Design a protein that fits this description.
about 120 residues, alpha+beta, Inhibitor of vertebrate lysozyme, Ivy, 2 helices, 8 strands, globular
Length: about 120
């Protein structure tokens, strides 16, 4: 069973979300991971608690707007990159990464500041 917080995330951000597949990866001395493919082609990776780590849209599509963290929305808008949409967002302890329809991507550190 997909953890509650992950089903809530899917149901909060996606329009008429339907699950096409769920892959559970269990490793001996590591934490369980979940990969979910929705019928609209969105792929999401969740940690064992059901916190999203990555959201990526199918080619030609963009992810929903409510997912990208505010500081990154602000940066993208300030640089006229918001309008074209985000195809992928990732986060971890090191920070955040956003990728755009054109192929441009930006990394931000844990504090929401640009990093190389």
């Amino acid at each position: 069973q997909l953890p509650l917080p992950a089903r809530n995330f899917i149901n909060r951000h996606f329009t008429k979300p339907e699950v096409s597949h769920i892959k559970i990866d269990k490793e001996m001395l590591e934490a369980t991971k979940y990969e979910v493919l929705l019928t609209d082609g969105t792929e999401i990776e969740f940690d064992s608690k059901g916190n999203w780590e990555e959201v990526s849209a199918r080619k030609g599509q963009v992810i929903p707007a409510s997912i990208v963290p505010n500081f990154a929305v602000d940066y993208l808008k300030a640089h006229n990159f918001a309008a074209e949409g985000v195809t992928k967002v990732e986060r971890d302890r090191k920070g955040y990464e956003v990728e755009l329809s054109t192929g441009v991507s930006f990394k931000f550190d844990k504090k929401g500041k640009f990093v190389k």
